[PDB]
């Protein structure tokens, strides 16, 4: 009875079940029959917002001086940086890249 | 090897208190931790796996927090049968390693011992020896002084004591002192006596017999 | 239920080997890793190693690479462990436990053996002598003297009497041997109507004894 489907905060490789990595963490090495899934911190300016078996953390969005933009909220390992424009310019949508 | 430190070897608490037992790891273990419970008789049960999940039978009272390097087992509403040694174990990296242990005892009201004294069996005397055993039954706290008195004179290290583990119902101890003498010396003397001093007797208690 | 039934206690000389045996049931032997754990008297748990039934594959704590050998017999649903080159550092309790291998239980070692006490000694075994502790609310018991090695198991009325019982830890006597008493409180009046017999097994010397305890 190798399990068909695993548990909520765990994935399946081959015959065996493994914890996911936590938000703020990337997969390094899959779980063994002895040790559990080896994860790692995202570090300075990347983020990953989810229980994940991902090999790289995503890059904090670039909040771009020369498209009318600055850092609204600093990103962190769980979150992503959030972008908002400079003043008399209102943002062209929620996601906020263009500005008049 | 990841060194797991349970920083408190033992501790005692009143029934219905909350106790927290701590386990830190020589380095981070990303929550990869179980908690075990060894009762006084040496049976080991799983309590909590992956930092905080209760195993099959375990009461709601029990719960595991922690992260990174520092973890906690917490028993809220302490019950008389929680007495055990609690042990944490890591599975982040081989070899699997365990904490030193944290022994949890109950703080309870003073309780005075029933005392009893037992002459040697006829049968044992036949063999050349005389064991005289005096029993202190169901008392608290564990500290008790016992003095043996042979026709009113006080013994030097010719007797040994043993004490039970805490009762998982009445949270009490019991203790046996045993005076061992060659059949010879036991014939020599007449009055055999057990004098107990204990935090729940105002004056010392004695039991005695004759032969 | 699921149970793991380790072998009874073993007394073995320095230099020798000993093999102890976990025997499983209520569960599928192949779906869980057999793990072995050591506990020296009054110390922590140490992990020795684990073995997987289908691979016959193994992980061993380095502390035990030259001590320990785990094997499996898939047919009887039984794991073995074998300690070799014995010294007295090895006198201890040895527990088996299991880890569900697919991962339903994460890395929970979830049900444990009762332990096997390995005692490592030059000395011959030796069975206990057993002497009533007579009475005149009312205490009585029975004294288990001059045995080696640990341990000894003491029931009353073949298991029926349990309420009231205490069985003290063994102490070493200057003689070299263990001794221990086992008492019970019963109510004064039952002396006369009830037979009280302490049943004393000492596995390593095939010694059993059932001593009645009458009043004086």
Author numbering:
A (entry chain R): 21 to 120
B (entry chain L): 1 to 211
C (entry chain H): 1 to 136, 144 to 223
Pull text from the paper:
One promising target is CD40, a member of the tumor necrosis factor receptor superfamily (TNFRSF) expressed on cells including B cells and specialized antigen-presenting cells. The ligand for CD40 (CD40L/CD154) is trimeric and believed to initiate CD40 activation by clustering the receptor in the cell membrane allowing recruitment of TNFR-associated factors leading to immune activation (Werneburg et al., 2001). Anti-CD40 monoclonal antibodies (mAbs) that promote or inhibit receptor function hold promise as therapeutics for cancer and autoimmunity. Here we demonstrate that a complex interplay between the location of the mAb epitope within CD40 and the isotype determines these differing levels of activity.
To precisely define the epitope bound by ChiLob 7/4 we determined the crystal structure of its Fab’ bound to a soluble CD40 extracellular domain (ECD). Residues 1–211 of the ChiLob 7/4 light chain (LC) and 1–223 of the heavy chain (HC) were resolved (with the exception of residues 139–144 within CH1 of the HC). CD40 was resolved in electron density for residues 21–120, corresponding to cysteine-rich domain 1 (CRD1), CRD2, and the majority of CRD3. The structure revealed that ChiLob 7/4 engaged an epitope at the N terminus of CD40 within CRD1. The complementarity-determining region (CDR) 3 of the ChiLob 7/4 HC formed interactions with CD40 giving the highest ΔG, as analyzed by PISA, mostly within the A1 region of CRD1. Protein crystallography elucidated the precise epitope for ChiLob 7/4; close to the N terminus of CD40, most distal from the cell membrane and on the opposite face of CD40 to the CD40L binding site. CHO-K1 cells stably transfected with CD40 proteins in which consecutive pairs of surface amino acids were mutated to alanine were used to define residues critical for mAb binding. Consistent with the data in Figure 3, residues R27 and E28 close to the N terminus of CD40 were found to be essential for CP870,893 binding, whereas ChiLob 7/4 was dependent upon residues F54 and T55 within the B2 domain of CRD1. ChiLob 7/4, SGN40, and CP870,893, all bound the full-length CD40 ECD, but not truncated forms where CRD1 was deleted, and hence must recognize epitopes on CRD1 for SGN40 and CP870,893 (Bjorck et al., 1994, Gladue et al., 2011). Flow cytometry demonstrated that none of the mAbs that engage CRD1 (ChiLob 7/4, SGN40, CP870,893, or Lob 7/2) prevented binding of CD40L to hCD40Tg mouse B cells, while mAbs that bound epitopes in CRD2-4 either partially (Lob 7/7) or completely (Lob 7/7, Lob 7/8, 24.2.1, and Lob 8/2) blocked CD40L binding. Importantly, and unlike m1, the activity of ChiLob 7/4-h2 and SGN40-h2 was independent of mFcγRII, showing comparable activity in mFcγRII KO mice, and confirming previous observations where F(ab’)2 fragments of ChiLob 7/4 h2 demonstrated wholly FcγR-independent activity in vivo (White et al., 2015).
